[PDB]
GROMACS .gro file of C-alpha atoms in nm:
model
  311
    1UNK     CA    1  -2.726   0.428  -0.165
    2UNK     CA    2  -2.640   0.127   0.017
    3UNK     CA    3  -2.506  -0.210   0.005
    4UNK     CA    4  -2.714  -0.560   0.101
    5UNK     CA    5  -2.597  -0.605   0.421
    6UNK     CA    6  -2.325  -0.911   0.464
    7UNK     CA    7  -2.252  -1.087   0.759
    8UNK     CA    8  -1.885  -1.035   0.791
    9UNK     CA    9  -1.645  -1.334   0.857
   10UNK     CA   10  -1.487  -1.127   1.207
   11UNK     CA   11  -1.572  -0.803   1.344
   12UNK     CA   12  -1.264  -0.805   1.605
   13UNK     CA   13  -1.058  -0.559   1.377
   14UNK     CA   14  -1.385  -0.338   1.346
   15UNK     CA   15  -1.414  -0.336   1.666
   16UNK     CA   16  -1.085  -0.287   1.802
   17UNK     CA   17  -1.062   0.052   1.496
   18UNK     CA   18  -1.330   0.194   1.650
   19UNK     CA   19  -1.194   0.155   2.003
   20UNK     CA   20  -0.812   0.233   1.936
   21UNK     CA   21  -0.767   0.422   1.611
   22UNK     CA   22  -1.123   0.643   1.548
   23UNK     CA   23  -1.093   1.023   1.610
   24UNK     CA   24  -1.428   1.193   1.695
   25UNK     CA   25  -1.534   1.270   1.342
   26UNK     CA   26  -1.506   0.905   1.219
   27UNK     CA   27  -1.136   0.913   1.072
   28UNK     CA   28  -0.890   0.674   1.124
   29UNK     CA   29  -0.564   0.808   1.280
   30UNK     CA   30  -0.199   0.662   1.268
   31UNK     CA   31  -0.139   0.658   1.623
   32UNK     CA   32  -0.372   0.632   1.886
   33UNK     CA   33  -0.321   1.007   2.097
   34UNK     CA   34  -0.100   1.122   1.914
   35UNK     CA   35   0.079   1.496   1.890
   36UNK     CA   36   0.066   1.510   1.511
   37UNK     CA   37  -0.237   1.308   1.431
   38UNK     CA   38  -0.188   1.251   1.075
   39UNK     CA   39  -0.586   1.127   0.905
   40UNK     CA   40  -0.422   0.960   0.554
   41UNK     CA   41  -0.581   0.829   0.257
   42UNK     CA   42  -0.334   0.548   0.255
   43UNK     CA   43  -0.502   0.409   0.613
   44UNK     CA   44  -0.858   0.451   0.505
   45UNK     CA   45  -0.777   0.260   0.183
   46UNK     CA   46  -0.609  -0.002   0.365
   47UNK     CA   47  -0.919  -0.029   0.593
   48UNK     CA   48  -1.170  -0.057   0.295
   49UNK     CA   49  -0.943  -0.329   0.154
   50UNK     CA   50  -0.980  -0.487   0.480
   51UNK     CA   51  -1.322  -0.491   0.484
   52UNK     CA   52  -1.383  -0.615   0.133
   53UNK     CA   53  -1.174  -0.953   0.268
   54UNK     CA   54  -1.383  -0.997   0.561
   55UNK     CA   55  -1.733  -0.931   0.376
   56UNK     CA   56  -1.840  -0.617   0.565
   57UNK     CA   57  -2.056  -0.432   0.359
   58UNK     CA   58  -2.185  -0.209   0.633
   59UNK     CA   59  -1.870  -0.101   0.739
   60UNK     CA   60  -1.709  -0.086   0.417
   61UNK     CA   61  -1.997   0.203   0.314
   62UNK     CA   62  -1.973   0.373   0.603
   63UNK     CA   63  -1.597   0.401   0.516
   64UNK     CA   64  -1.685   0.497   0.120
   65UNK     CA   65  -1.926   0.790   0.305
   66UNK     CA   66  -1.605   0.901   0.498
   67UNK     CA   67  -1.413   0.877   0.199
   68UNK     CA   68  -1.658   1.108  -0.016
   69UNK     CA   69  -1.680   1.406   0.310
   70UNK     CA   70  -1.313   1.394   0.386
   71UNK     CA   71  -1.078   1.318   0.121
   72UNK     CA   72  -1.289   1.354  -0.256
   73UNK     CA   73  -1.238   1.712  -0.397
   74UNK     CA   74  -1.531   1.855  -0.608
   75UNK     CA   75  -1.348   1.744  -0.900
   76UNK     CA   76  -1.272   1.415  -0.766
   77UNK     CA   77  -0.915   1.405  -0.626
   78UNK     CA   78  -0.858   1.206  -0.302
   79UNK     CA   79  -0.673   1.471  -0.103
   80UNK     CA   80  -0.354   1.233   0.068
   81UNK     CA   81  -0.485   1.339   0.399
   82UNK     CA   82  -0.775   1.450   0.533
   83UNK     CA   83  -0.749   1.851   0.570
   84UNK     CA   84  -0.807   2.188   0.466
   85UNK     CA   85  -0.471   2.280   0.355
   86UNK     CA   86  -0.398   1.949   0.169
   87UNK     CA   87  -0.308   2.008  -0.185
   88UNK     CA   88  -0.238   1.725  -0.355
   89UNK     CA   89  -0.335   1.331  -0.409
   90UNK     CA   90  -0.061   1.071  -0.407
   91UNK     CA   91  -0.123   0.783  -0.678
   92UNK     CA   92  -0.067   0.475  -0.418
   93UNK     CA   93  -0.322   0.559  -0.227
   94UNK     CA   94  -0.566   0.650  -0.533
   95UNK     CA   95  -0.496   0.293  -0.635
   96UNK     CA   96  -0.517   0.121  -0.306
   97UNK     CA   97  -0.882   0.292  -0.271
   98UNK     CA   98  -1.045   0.249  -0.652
   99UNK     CA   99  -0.848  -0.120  -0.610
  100UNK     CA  100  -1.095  -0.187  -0.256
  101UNK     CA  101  -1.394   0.010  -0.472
  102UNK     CA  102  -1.361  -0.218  -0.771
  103UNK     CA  103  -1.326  -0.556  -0.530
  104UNK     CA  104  -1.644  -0.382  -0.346
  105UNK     CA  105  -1.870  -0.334  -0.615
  106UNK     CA  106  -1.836  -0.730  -0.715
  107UNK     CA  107  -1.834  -0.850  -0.339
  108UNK     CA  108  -2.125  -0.664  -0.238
  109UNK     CA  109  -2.276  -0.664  -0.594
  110UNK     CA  110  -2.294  -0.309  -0.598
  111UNK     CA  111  -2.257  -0.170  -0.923
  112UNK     CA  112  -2.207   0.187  -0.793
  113UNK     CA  113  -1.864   0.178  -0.649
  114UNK     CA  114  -1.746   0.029  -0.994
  115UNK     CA  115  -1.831   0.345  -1.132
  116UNK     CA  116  -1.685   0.618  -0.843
  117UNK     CA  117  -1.382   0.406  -0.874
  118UNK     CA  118  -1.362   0.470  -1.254
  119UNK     CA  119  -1.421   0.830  -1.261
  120UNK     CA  120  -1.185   0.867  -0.992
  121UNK     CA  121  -0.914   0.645  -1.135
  122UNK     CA  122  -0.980   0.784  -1.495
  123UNK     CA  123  -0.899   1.191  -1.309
  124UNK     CA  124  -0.588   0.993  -1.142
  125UNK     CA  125  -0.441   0.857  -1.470
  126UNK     CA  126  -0.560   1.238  -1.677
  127UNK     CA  127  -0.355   1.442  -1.411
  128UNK     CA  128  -0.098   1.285  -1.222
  129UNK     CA  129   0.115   1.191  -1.515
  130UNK     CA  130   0.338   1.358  -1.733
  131UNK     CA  131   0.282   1.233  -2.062
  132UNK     CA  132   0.127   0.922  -1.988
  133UNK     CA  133   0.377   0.814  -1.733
  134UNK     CA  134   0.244   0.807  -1.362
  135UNK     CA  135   0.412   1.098  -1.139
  136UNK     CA  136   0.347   1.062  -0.767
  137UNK     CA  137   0.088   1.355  -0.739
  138UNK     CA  138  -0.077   1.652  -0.898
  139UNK     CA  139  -0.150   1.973  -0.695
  140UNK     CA  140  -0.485   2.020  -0.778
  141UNK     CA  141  -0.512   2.401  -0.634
  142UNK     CA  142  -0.182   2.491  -0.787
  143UNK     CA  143  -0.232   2.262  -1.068
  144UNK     CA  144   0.090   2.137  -1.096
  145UNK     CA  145   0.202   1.781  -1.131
  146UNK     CA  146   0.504   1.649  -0.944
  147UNK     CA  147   0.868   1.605  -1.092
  148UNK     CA  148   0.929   1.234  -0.920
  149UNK     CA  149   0.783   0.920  -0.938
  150UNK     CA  150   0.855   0.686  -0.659
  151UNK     CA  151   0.841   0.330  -0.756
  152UNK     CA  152   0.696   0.212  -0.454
  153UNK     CA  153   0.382   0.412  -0.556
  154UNK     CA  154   0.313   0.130  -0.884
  155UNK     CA  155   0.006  -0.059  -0.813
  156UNK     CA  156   0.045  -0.273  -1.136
  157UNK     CA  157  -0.309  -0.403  -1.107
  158UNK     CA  158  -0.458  -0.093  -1.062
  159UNK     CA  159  -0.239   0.037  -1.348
  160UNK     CA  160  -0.381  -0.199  -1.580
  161UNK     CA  161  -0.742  -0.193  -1.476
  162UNK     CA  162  -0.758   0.205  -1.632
  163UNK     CA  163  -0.515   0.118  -1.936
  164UNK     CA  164  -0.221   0.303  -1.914
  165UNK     CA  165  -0.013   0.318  -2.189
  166UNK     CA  166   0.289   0.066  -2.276
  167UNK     CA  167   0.550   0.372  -2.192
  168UNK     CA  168   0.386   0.422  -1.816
  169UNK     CA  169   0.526   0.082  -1.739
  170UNK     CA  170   0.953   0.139  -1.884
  171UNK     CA  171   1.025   0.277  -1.514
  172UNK     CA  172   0.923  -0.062  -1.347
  173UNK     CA  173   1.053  -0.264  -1.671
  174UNK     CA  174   1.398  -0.107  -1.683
  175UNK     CA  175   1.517  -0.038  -1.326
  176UNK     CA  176   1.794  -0.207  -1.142
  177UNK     CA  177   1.874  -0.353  -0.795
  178UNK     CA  178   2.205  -0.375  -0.681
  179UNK     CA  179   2.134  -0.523  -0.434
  180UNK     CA  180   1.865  -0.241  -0.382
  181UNK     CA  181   1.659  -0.088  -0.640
  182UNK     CA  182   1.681   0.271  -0.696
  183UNK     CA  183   1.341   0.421  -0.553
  184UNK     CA  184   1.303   0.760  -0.798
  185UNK     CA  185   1.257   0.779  -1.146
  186UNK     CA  186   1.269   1.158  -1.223
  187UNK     CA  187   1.390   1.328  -1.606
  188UNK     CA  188   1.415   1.029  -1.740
  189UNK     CA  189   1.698   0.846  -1.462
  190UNK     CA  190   1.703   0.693  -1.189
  191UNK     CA  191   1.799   0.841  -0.816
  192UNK     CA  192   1.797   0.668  -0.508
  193UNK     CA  193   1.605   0.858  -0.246
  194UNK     CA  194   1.856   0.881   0.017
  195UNK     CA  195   2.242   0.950   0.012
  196UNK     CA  196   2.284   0.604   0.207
  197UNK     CA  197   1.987   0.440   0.364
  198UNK     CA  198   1.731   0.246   0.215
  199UNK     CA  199   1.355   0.178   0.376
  200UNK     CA  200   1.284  -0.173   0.317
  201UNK     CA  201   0.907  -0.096   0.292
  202UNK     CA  202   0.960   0.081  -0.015
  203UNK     CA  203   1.192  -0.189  -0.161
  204UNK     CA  204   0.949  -0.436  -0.084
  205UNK     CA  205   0.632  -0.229  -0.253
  206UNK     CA  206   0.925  -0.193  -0.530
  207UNK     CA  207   0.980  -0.576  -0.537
  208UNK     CA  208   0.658  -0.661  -0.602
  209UNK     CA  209   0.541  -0.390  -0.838
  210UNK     CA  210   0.873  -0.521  -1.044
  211UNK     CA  211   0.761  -0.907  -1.034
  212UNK     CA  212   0.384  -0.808  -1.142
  213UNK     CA  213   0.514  -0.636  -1.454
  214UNK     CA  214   0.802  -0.842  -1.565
  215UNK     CA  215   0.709  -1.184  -1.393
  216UNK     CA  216   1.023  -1.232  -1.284
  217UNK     CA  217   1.163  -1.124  -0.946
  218UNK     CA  218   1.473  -0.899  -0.993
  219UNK     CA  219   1.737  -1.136  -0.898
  220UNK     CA  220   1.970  -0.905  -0.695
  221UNK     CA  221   1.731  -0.789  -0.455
  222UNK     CA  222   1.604  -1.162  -0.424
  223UNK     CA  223   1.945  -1.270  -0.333
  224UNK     CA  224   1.954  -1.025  -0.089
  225UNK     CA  225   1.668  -1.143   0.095
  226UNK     CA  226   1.713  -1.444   0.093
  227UNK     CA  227   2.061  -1.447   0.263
  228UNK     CA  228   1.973  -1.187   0.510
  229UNK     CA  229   1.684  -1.461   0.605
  230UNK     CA  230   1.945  -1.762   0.578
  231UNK     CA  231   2.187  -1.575   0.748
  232UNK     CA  232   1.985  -1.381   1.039
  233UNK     CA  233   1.643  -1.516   1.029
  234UNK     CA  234   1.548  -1.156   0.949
  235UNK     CA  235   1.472  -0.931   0.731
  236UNK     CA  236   1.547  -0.577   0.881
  237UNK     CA  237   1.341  -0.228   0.856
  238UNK     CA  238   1.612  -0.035   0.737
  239UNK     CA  239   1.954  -0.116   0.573
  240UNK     CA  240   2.280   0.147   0.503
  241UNK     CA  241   2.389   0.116   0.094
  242UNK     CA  242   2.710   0.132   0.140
  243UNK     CA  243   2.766  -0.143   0.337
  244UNK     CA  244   2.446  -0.309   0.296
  245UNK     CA  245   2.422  -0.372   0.672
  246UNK     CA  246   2.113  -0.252   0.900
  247UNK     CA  247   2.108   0.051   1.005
  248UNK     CA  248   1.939  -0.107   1.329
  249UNK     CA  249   1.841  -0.376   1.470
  250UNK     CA  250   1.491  -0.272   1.411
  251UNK     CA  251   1.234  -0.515   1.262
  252UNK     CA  252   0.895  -0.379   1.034
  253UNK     CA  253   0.601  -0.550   1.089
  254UNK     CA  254   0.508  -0.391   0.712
  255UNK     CA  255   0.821  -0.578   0.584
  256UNK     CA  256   0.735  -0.894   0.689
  257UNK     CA  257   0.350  -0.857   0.571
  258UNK     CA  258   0.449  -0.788   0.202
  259UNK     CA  259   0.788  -1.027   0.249
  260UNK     CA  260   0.498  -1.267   0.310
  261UNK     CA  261   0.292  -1.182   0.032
  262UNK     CA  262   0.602  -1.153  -0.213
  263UNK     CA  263   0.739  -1.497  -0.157
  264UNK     CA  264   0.371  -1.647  -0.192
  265UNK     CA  265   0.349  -1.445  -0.504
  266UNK     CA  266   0.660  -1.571  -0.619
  267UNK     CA  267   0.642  -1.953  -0.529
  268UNK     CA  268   0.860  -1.939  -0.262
  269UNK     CA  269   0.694  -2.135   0.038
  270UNK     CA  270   0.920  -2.195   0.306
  271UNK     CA  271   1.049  -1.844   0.281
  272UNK     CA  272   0.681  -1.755   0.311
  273UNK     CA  273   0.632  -1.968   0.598
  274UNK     CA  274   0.912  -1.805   0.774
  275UNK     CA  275   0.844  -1.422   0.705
  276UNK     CA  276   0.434  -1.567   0.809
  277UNK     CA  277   0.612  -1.674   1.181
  278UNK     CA  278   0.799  -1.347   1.165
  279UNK     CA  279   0.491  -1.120   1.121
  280UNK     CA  280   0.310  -1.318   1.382
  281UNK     CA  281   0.588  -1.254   1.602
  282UNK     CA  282   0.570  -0.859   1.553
  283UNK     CA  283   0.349  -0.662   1.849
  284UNK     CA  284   0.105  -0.452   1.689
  285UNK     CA  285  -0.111  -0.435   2.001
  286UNK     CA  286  -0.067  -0.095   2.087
  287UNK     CA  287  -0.226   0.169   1.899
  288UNK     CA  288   0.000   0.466   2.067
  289UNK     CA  289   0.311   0.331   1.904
  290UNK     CA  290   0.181   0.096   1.608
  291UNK     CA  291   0.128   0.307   1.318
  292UNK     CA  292  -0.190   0.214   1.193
  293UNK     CA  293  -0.026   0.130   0.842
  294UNK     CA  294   0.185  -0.181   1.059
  295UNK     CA  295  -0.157  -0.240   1.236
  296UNK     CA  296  -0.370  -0.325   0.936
  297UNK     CA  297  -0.125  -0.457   0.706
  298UNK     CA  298  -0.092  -0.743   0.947
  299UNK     CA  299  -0.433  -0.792   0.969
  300UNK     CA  300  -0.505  -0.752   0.612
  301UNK     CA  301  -0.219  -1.012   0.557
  302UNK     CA  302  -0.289  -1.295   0.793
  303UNK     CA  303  -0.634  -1.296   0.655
  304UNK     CA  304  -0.581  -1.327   0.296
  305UNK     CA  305  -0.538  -1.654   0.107
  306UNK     CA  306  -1.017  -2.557   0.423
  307UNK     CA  307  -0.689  -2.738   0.385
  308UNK     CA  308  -0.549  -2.793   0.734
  309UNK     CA  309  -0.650  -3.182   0.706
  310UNK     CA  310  -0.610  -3.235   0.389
  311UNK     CA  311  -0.643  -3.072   0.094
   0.00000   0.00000   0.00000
């Protein structure tokens, strides 16, 4: 059970995981020596999609073998993170990972992770959803499904590639920005998900999850970006409602990876070329304070798509 080995377009990232964010037993961590090591789903996935982009089969199974001790339950759930008294799955990261299997299975022409990542994506779409609209888990030991759904858990490709039903997509269709969208859709209604701040990595995840479905951006939150860039040649981490200013000074390095991909995605090139600088700019050299997710989004980013001299 085992890819053709591929000769992998840069190991540096490989290399530097294994050095900076590997715990003993193979999993990646958040932060390098950390108090609360945290082993999540969500970084493993991101990993996996990594190494799809740069061709590394051997890697990328190695990572699938991790995947199937750690984190797939006997009735194939991806626990969120990797331990005993984990409970429950959490759709993004179900996506992100049978999203990286299906990529897999055609880069490495390897039929097999086509079919884990439809019988796991089949059990995601059977049992975290509450009448064929996604939820953002289902407690598979208490076997109970969760009362929110978070739009910044849509993976609208991933949605489609399993076939949910017309109605799973109305949250994403019908909600609002102004100038932020609403994160929860719970009974029917949107909620934000905090009395007065928003976390601009969720509206981003949000943005784009809202352009894939409706192919159009929502205008509101658009504006809004694009006069925070205009105006402060930033985009910041987190911003107060109310008031819509920052609640810091604080940049994302996240933010500016999926800024980037959402104004590439939405033919807007010199805003891409700016939030492009701006990522470049962000430090994600040290693994005790860069969460991995900020580590490898970057990396994940600045290598996805011979035309420097001409085209």
């Amino acid at each position: 059970s085992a890819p053709k080995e591929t000769t992998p377009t840069s190991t540096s990232v490989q290399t530097y995981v294994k050095e900076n964010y590997t715990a003993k037993n193979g999993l990646i961590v958040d932060y390098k020596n950390a108090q609360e090591p945290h082993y999540l789903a969500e970084s493993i996935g991101l990993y996996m999609e990594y190494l799809v982009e740069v061709n590394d089969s051997k890697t990328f199974q190695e990572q699938v073998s991790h995947l199937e001790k750690n984190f797939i339950t006997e009735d194939n759930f991806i626990k969120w993170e990797a331990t005993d008294a984990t409970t429950t799955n959490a759709i993004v990261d179900d996506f992100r990972i049978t999203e990286a299997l299906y990529q897999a299975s055609e880069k490495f022409s390897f039929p097999s992770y086509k079919k884990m990542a439809d019988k796991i994506l089949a059990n995601t779409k059977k049992y975290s959803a509450e009448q064929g609209v996604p939820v953002d888990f289902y407690d598979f030991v208490h076997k109970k499904k969760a009362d929110t759904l978070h739009l910044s858990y849509l993976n609208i490709q991933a949605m489609q590639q399993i076939n949910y039903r017309d109605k799973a997509y109305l949250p994403i269709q019908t909600v609002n920005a102004d100038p932020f969208f609403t994160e929860v859709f719970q009974n029917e209604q949107f909620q934000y998900a905090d009395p007065s701040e928003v976390n601009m990595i969720d509206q981003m995840l949000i943005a784009m999850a809202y352009f894939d479905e409706n192919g159009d951006v929502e205008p509101n939150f658009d504006n809004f970006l694009q006069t925070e860039l205009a105006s402060k040649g930033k985009v910041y981490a987190r911003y107060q409602r109310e008031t819509k200013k920052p609640s810091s000074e604080n940049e994302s390095t996240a933010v500016y990876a999926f800024l980037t991909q959402y104004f590439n995605k939405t033919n807007q090139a010199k805003n891409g070329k700016i939030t492009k600088e701006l990522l470049e700019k962000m430090d994600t050299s040290n693994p005790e304070t860069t969460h991995f997710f900020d580590y490898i989004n970057k990396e994940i980013t600045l290598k996805k798509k011979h035309h420097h001299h001409h085209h």
